[PDB]
Design a protein around this nucleic acid. Structure first.
Lengths: 70, 29
RNA sequence: UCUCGAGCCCUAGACAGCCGGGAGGUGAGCUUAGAAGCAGCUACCCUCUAAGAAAAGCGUAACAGCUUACCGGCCGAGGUU
């Protein structure tokens, strides 16, 4: 259904590609709120009951691409 | 006497309070 | 094939076998027309949960598909190094 994570990130992030090596090369950032929204768009694709966990799922694809948070 | 089997029995008993053998074990308590 | 010894596992059910489950984000990101566990490079994180790898071996043009891990059941006594 609703589009994938990789993209929903590259939008609010403002970038197109990732980093050859994540956590080492922080390509983009994402406010906590920004991650709260994405988590809301994927409510159907995710298994989590609370929004808290849904985040941990999304907040798991970013840092693995150089997408720090604030 | 594995520690994970002990933590389980307690974990199970904590849900009943609020592996088949482990369930029985818990129920027996 | 006989005998002696050591370590570890086991009726909170061991070893093997058989049955059932092996799931979602997501077909990870990169490279690439394409690559989705499995060409190569890097990373290898969290949800549900009794389990289930960013996938150990085959398989495909790439999917699909078949299985290992891992969990549960049946069974019931020694098993393994």
């Amino acid at each position: 259904g609703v589009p994938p994570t990789a993209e929903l990130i590259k939008d609010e992030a403002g970038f197109e590609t990732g980093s050859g090596e994540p956590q080492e090369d922080f390509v983009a950032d994402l406010s906590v709120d920004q991650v709260k929204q994405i988590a809301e768009q994927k409510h159907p694709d995710l298994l989590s009951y609370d929004l808290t966990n849904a985040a941990k799922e999304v907040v798991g694809t970013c840092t693995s691409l150089g997408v720090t948070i604030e | 006497i594995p520690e994970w089997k002990q933590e389980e029995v307690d974990a199970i008993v904590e849900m009943i309070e609020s592996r088949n053998t482990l369930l029985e074990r818990a129920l027996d308590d």
